[PDB]
Design a protein around this ligand. Structure first.
Ligand SMILES: CCCCCCCCCCCCCCCCCC(=O)OC[C@H](COP(=O)(O)OCCN)OC(=O)CCCCCCCCCCCCCCCCC
Ligand SMILES: CCCCCCCCCCCCCCCCCC(=O)OC[C@H](COP(=O)(O)OCCN)OC(=O)CCCCCCCCCCCCCCCCC
Ligand SMILES: CCCCCCCCCCCCCCCCCC(=O)OC[C@H](COP(=O)(O)OCCN)OC(=O)CCCCCCCCCCCCCCCCC
Ligand SMILES: CCCCCCCCCCCCCCCCCC(=O)OC[C@H](COP(=O)(O)OCCN)OC(=O)CCCCCCCCCCCCCCCCC
Ligand SMILES: CCCCCCCCCCCCCCCCCC(=O)OC[C@H](COP(=O)(O)OCCN)OC(=O)CCCCCCCCCCCCCCCCC
Ligand SMILES: CCCCCCCCCCCCCCCCCC(=O)OC[C@H](COP(=O)(O)OCCN)OC(=O)CCCCCCCCCCCCCCCCC
Ligand SMILES: CCCCCCCCCCCC(=O)OC[C@H](COP(=O)(O)OCC[N+](C)(C)C)OC(=O)CCCCCCCCCCC
Ligand SMILES: CCCCCCCCCCCC(=O)OC[C@H](COP(=O)(O)OCC[N+](C)(C)C)OC(=O)CCCCCCCCCCC
Ligand SMILES: CCCCCCCCCCCC(=O)OC[C@H](COP(=O)(O)OCC[N+](C)(C)C)OC(=O)CCCCCCCCCCC
Ligand SMILES: CCCCCCCCCCCC(=O)OC[C@H](COP(=O)(O)OCC[N+](C)(C)C)OC(=O)CCCCCCCCCCC
Lengths: 105, 80, 128, 77, 10, 45, 69, 53, 65, 132, 88, 257
């Protein structure tokens, strides 16, 4: 679908793209003081393109952004233990609560 | 206080002492007291210190004999 | 065990118990597929270990340690090589040597006490 | 009984198809290639290994008639 | 606490 | 602005997490080993 | 805590933090049972085991080699 | 319990049993390393044979 | 002594396997730990006899094949 | 970015069975709700003819890089460890033996190594100590 | 004993510290449970992302996009953290 | 064989300790993370867990005087004591593994214990040691990781010690040329590279961490990714061997049955 800047569906696409940018920075950079420098550099690059009207510019930028995010993706991201993909995910799931149906077998 | 290699053990004395095959060599005479001392002392590092040092030095002399042989072998190989 | 068949009984049930320990949290999809991965790679090693035992019966007529080890010097080199190549493949699977080492890191899906036991004085040392 | 299984139409369609793959099988070039490999090529390979070494492996109590270790050492220099 | 209740006698 | 979380990240390098405190005691009982060894050397004499 | 559905799921191992009310009574019986035939293992083992290196004298083995020669 | 905002984390108040046990095991290791090194530094590093007392 | 070293952990497996429902969580863990410890003390006793005294043990239960 | 596993047909024809693009269910977003959360499947979703190769129970599909790149990197690694081995062998950079290898009396312990008589000496003998 | 549970009093305390330590919040801007990000605290879209990524890191969770876009007030954030079985 | 059996016994002591002390840290952190990138500054809060890891790592690193030193140093030197082509190649492989052992041990210790805190502040106020039942086996194994190798060395490694179960052919005895013919530089070469290399690695983390932002360099990122994905072996096994193994069954099912 075409991109309409300043729309609600554009404030969710850029926001998610910014999340994946910062998470990828966090996976690669494991020191908090070093992460803040990279986190601000990423944000300033978002601020530069913040005021753009032409969708024909945004789609060129949006396609390029995913090229960088996919290229810089960490092969081993950081996942919380109980989240999907974590070390404790689906461990000791409580059983389903439902009355047993008796059968004659 | 081992200066040179001891007298070689006979075949029968090697069988009587159940010496390992790989250690039936020039120093098998010094191995018999050491394995006898090792068993009595539970192989502890502090028990049979002197008997162990004597046998280690014997293998050092057997090694240095084999160092001399290879130099001798090379001389025949170089000059042939 | 006094012979190789008794060793193979322990060899298999180590893989059986490792399968149940790695997949102990069986509601976790990762632990379930990791227990299968450890079992199948080791069962690949078991298939080679069985062949080595069949060849041992063919050449020596026995699996007892006392019989087989007395004949080691007098047996054909090729027969000796075939038996121990089969033993080498089985050793790689359990000891996680290169080629059959993929299950070893999947075995971390089990509880840490399993890891402390399997990887220290157990299954990983069976091949040695 | 009480229908203890929640029947899924897509499961039933998928399962019914997997049982009835024979209906749609065509003996085309792709099928012929796999038939030749599995029923002619591979059996021939095992066929020639079985009769090549039929009675050619007297491995019962096979003896060693040749030394394993070298007697003399020759340096490389 | 956990205070895990005890089940029926077995 | 510059480092908006600067006040939030301050605790990560202060208190117990200064460069001195983090590496202090990194060798557990090192001087106790030297002290007991020193007692052994002097008592042997 | 949670719901373990213990009304009908009673596996031999217990099913989600199962400790019966009379666990002290049963534990003593099992400890007696474990101890009783743990001695039975010891009594059997001492009778049945043997030293395979002392069953035949070295003089008996020399005759075997010559006779089989 | 109550959470204190902005307060930094000071050096922890680790129970004395945990600290002393940790320093006894660590001191036991360092003592053994120094004790073994003193009598075996020549033997270890090939600067003297074990029988050359 | 040899039968104690080998089969005592197997009895601990059975007790926590089939009698875990009857002795509860707490006592099941410790009785299994008891069975392994018996194998520990038996093994150490056998270690002295074998390594330090050159004694071999062999128990032949029955024929398999 | 994300690619399908191998041996997945691009088309099929099984009568009236619905034709759909193969979706590897292992890659589905795990933060969505499903009627079958573990399998990431909603009720009555049509199944591909080879869905068993494209679901949770199929072997995990690693797709960080293409297979050829992973196979190229895999060969590149072990190629270095073979060039390192081959440089030393051809050049002969490994050290020579500092001593003549161990030899033993009694014709190299021939009798102790299962030799019957003089015809089978070198068959069983270890290295012979020529210096008595 | 482990951490003594996680009640809404603690969750709110650990959220206020985030907003108090985030200088991008507009001057004034009393931090209240009903305070919003855009209006009360003057946070735009990208700054809202930074706050919620510090939120997920504080309680050691990962926030989906479908649910981060619906978190627009402090109270909604507090209710969300309490609605997560693995927030610590 | 005698060296292998001895190193087998010693490894079971300090490697079980390392797994036990790893599970101690994982339980202690209330988030129950297992990623060292989410650790940092743990040394003070759990000093007993750090001591067990520290001693076990030093035992693993074959630090002189410890149990790993009496079993691992001799094995590495025996590769050079073979004086064959294969022995010389494998000596360097063993030497690098010995050096890499120090490297990944220091890296694991730095990230978990000596790094600046990466976890939330709430984690560190709740970070406490576990009970005495967890601690007791670790202490018992800790002592075995200090002395045990020295006591048992003469049983398995002593020259002429009778172990007829492990048969060594007389042509293959190399324990003596291993013990007498190696240069003194090689006697300490594994110790220098591990200790010297480990210190250099530790300095970079604390003072010059900008070198480890490998996402910058594309070649470093590909070299980092290759090893982090384990030589791409798991991908090759699943995507090629297992996929084609199941596809053969499908082809047999479709085109034959
Ligand atoms: C122990 C039984 C007594 C051993 C004889 C006394 C002794 O001197 O050895 C103590 C021993 C450390 O001494 P060590 O260097 O191993 O050898 C003897 C040095 N004269 O001490 C030890 O070996 C302690 C080993 C850990 C316990
Ligand atoms: C002889 C050649 C090998 C024969 C291959 C036979 C075809 C494959 C048969 C197994 C079918 C796959 C299966 O059973 O389920 C998939 C299972 C899951 O494994 P996976 O997803 O990778 O584990 C991740 C856990 N989170 O995958 C598995 O764990 C299967 C384990 C492998 C089965 C044995 C393969 C041994 C290959 C040895 C050679 C390897 C190269 C050297
Ligand atoms: C897994 C597969 C199951 C096990 C199969 C084992 C097959 C190994 C057979 C042993 C063997 O034949 O070794 C000899 C081999 C080639 O045989 P050849 O050189 O013709 O005869 C040697 C006579 N001195 O020459 C060699 O020794 C080296 C090449 C084979 C070594 C194993 C690889
Ligand atoms: C032994 C006798 C060998 C007979 C071989 C029969 C070959 C055969 O029937 O092939 C199948 C073919 C139908 O074609 P199909 O399978 O649908 O795929 C083709 C797509 N282009 O079938 C046909 O092409 C139709 C001709 C069938 C002739 C069958 C002859 C039967 C008489 C001998 C029975 C024995
Ligand atoms: C469900 C159970 C199915 C019941 C049917 C199975 C019946 C088993 C066969 C009955 C045999 C009767 C018997 O025990 O004979 C006693 C036997 C004496 O025979 P003997 O010739 O003197 O011994 C020679 C050994 N070299 O003495 C023996 O040799 C037996 C000693 C063998 C020990 C092997 C131990 C295997 C594992 C035992 C676990 C259970 C034992 C512990 C009991 C509970 C402990 C808490
Ligand atoms: C045991 C018997 C092993 C027989 C090996 C058979 C090898 C083989 O037939 O490979 C063919 C197969 C590709 O065949 P196919 O799927 O029909 O490709 C056309 C798709 N448009 O390719 C494969 O399925 C990979 C098989 C390689 C593993 C051998
Ligand atoms: C699931 C389906 C399985 C089907 C059955 C499988 C068994 C196949 C047996 C093959 C035997 C084989 O290959 O024997 C080979 C023979 C003759 O060999 P030759 O080279 O001419 O003579 C051999 C002499 N040499 C070695 C000196 C050259 O060939 C035939 O005349 C086979 C006739 C029947 C198959 C066409
Ligand atoms: C050498 C031969 C050894 C023989 C004795 C070994 C101990 C026997 C244990 C029996 C009790 C048990 O494990 O089965 C019962 C337990 C029950 O699970 P729970 O822990 O009570 O939790 C209850 C909560 N559920 C209901 C969610 C699980 O397991 C199961 O149904 C789990 C499924 C796997 C079956 C395991 C069978 C193992 C057999 C070994 C095959 C060789
Ligand atoms: C696969 C990539 C790994 C490196 C390849 C080594 C290249 C080479 O040249 O290795 C050759 C080596 C060495 O044995 P050799 O030279 O035949 O005999 C040397 C005889 N000595 C040692 C008594 C002097 O054997 C191998 O590779 C072993 C088999 C393959 C293992 C994998
Ligand atoms: C002897 C071996 C010498 C090489 C080891 C140096 C330390 C190291 O590998 O580290 C240096 C770096 C990575 O930095 P790191 O500290 O490992 O992780 C921190 C990285 N982050 C923070 C981005 C997550 O490695 C590499 O990317 C090199 C490729 C790994 C294989 C090592 C060489 C293979 C031959």
């Amino acid at each position: 679908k075409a991109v309409v800047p300043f729309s609600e569906a554009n404030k969710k696409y850029v926001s998610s793209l910014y999340r994946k940018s910062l998470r990828t920075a966090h996976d690669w950079i494991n020191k908090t003081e070093f992460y803040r420098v990279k986190a601000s550099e990423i944000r300033s690059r978002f601020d530069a393109n913040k005021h753009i009207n032409d969708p024909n510019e945004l789609k060129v930028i949006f396609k390029e952004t995913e090229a960088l995010l996919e290229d810089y993706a960490h092969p081993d991201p950081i996942i919380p233990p109980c989240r999907p993909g974590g070390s404790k995910f689906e461990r000791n799931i409580p059983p389903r609560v439902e009355a047993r149906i008796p059968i004659d077998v | 206080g081992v200066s040179e290699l001891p007298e070689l053990l006979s075949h029968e004395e090697m069988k009587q002492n159940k010496i390992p095959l790989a250690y039936r060599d020039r120093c098998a005479r010094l191995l018999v007291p050491l394995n006898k001392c090792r068993k009595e002392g539970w192989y502890m590092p502090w028990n049979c210190v002197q008997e162990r040092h004597d046998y280690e030095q014997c293998q050092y002399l057997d090694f240095k004999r084999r160092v001399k042989e290879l130099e001798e072998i090379k001389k025949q190989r170089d000059a042939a | 065990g006094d012979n190789y068949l008794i060793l193979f009984v322990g060899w298999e049930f180590i893989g059986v118990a490792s399968y149940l320990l790695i997949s102990f949290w069986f509601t976790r999809f990762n632990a379930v597929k990791s227990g299968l991965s450890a079992l199948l790679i080791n069962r690949f090693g078991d298939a080679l270990l069985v062949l080595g035992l069949s060849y041992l019966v063919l050449v020596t007529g026995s699996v007892n340690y006392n019989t087989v080890f007395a004949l080691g010097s007098y047996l054909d080199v090729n027969m000796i090589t075939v038996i121990l190549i089969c033993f080498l493949v089985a050793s790689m699977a359990k000891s996680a040597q290169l080629g059959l080492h993929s299950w070893l890191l999947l075995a971390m899906e089990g509880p840490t006490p399993v890891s402390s036991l399997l990887h220290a004085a157990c299954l990983v040392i069976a091949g040695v | 009984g009480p229908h203890l299984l929640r029947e899924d139409a897509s499961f039933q369609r998928y399962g019914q198809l997997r049982d009835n793959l024979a209906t749609y099988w065509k003996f085309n070039r792709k099928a012929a290639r796999n038939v030749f490999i599995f029923l002619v090529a591979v059996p021939a390979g095992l066929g020639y290994l079985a009769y090549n070494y039929e009675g050619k492996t007297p491995f019962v109590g096979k003896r060693r008639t040749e030394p394993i270790f070298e007697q003399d050492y020759v340096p490389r220099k | 606490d956990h205070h895990t209740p005890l089940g029926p006698a077995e | 602005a510059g480092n908006p979380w600067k006040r939030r990240d301050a605790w990560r390098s202060q208190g117990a997490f200064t460069r001195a405190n983090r590496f202090r005691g990194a060798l557990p009982g090192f001087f106790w080993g030297l002290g007991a060894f020193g007692v052994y050397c002097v008592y042997e004499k | 805590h949670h719901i373990h559905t213990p009304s009908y799921i009673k596996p031999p191992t217990g099913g989600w933090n199962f400790t019966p009310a009379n666990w002290k009574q049963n534990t003593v019986l099992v400890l007696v049972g474990f101890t009783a035939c743990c001695v039975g293992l010891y009594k059997l083992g001492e009778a049945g085991s043997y030293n395979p290196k002392l069953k035949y004298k070295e003089e008996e083995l020399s005759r075997w080699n010559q006779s089989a020669k | 319990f109550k959470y204190v905002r902005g307060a930094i984390v000071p050096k922890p108040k680790v129970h004395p049993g945990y600290v002393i046990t940790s320093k006894f095991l660590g001191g036991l290791m360092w003592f053994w390393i120094f004790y073994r090194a003193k009598q075996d530094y020549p033997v270890w590093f090939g600067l003297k044979h074990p029988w050359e007392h | 002594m040899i039968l104690l070293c080998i089969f005592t952990p197997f009895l601990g497996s059975l007790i926590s396997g089939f009698f875990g429902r009857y002795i509860g969580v707490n006592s099941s863990k410790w009785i299994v730990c008891l069975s392994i410890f018996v194998s520990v003390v038996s093994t150490y006793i056998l270690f002295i006899d074998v390594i330090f005294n050159e004694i071999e043990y062999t128990y032949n239960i029955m024929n398999w094949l | 970015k994300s690619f399908l596993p191998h041996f997945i047909p691009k088309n099929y024809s099984y009568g009236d069975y619905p034709r759909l693009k193969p979706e590897n269910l292992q890659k589905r977003d795990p933060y969505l709700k499903y009627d079958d959360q573990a399998n990431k499947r909603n009720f009555n979703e049509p199944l591909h003819p080879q869905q068993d190769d494209l679901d949770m129970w199929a072997p995990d599909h690693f797709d960080f890089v293409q297979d050829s790149i992973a196979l190229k990197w895999f060969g590149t690694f072990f190629g270095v460890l073979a060039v390192f081995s081959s440089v030393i062998y051809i050049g002969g950079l490994y050290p020579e033996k500092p001593a003549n290898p161990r030899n033993y009396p009694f014709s190299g312990l021939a009798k102790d190594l299962g030799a019957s008589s003089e015809e089978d000496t070198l068959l069983y003998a270890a290295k012979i100590d020529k210096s008595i | 004993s482990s951490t003594p549970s996680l009640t809404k009093e603690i969750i709110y305390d650990r959220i206020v510290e985030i907003l108090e330590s985030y200088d991008n919040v507009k001057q004034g801007s009393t931090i209240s449970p009903a305070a919003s990000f855009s209006k009360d605290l003057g946070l735009d879209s990208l700054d809202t992302v930074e706050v919620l990524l510090e939120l997920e890191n504080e309680f050691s969770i990962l926030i989906p996009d479908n649910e981060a876009d619906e978190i627009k007030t402090v109270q909604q954030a507090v209710d969300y953290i309490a609605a997560q079985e693995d927030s610590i | 064989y005698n060296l292998a059996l001895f190193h087998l016994i010693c490894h079971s002591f300090f490697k079980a300790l390392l797994f036990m002390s790893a599970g101690s840290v994982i339980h202690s952190i209330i988030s129950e993370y297992q990623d060292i990138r989410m650790y940092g500054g743990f040394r003070q809060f759990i000093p007993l867990a750090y001591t067990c890891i520290f001693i076990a790592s030093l035992s693993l690193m074959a630090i002189p005087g410890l149990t790993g030193f009496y079993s691992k140093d001799i094995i590495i030197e025996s590769m050079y004591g073979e004086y064959t082509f294969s022995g010389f190649i494998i000596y360097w492989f063993a030497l690098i593994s010995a050096t890499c052992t120090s490297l990944y041990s220091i890296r694991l210790i730095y990230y978990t214990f000596l790094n600046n805190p990466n976890s939330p502040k709430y984690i560190y106020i709740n970070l406490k040691e576990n009970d005495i039942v967890l601690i007791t086996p670790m202490i018992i194994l800790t002592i075995l990781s200090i002395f045990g190798g020295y006591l048992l060395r003469d049983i398995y490694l002593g020259m002429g010690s009778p172990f007829n179960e492990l048969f060594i052919h007389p042509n293959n005895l190399s324990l003596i040329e291993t013990e007498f013919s190696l240069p003194s530089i090689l006697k300490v070469l594994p110790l220098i590279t591990g200790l010297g290399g480990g210190l250099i690695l530790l300095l970079i983390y604390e003072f010059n961490y900008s070198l480890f932002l490998v996402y910058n360099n594309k070649n470093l990122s590909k070299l980092y990714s290759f090893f982090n994905q384990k030589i791409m072996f798991d991908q090759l096994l699943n995507n090629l061997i297992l996929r084609s193994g199941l596809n053969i069954g499908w082809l047999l099912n479709v085109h034959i049955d």
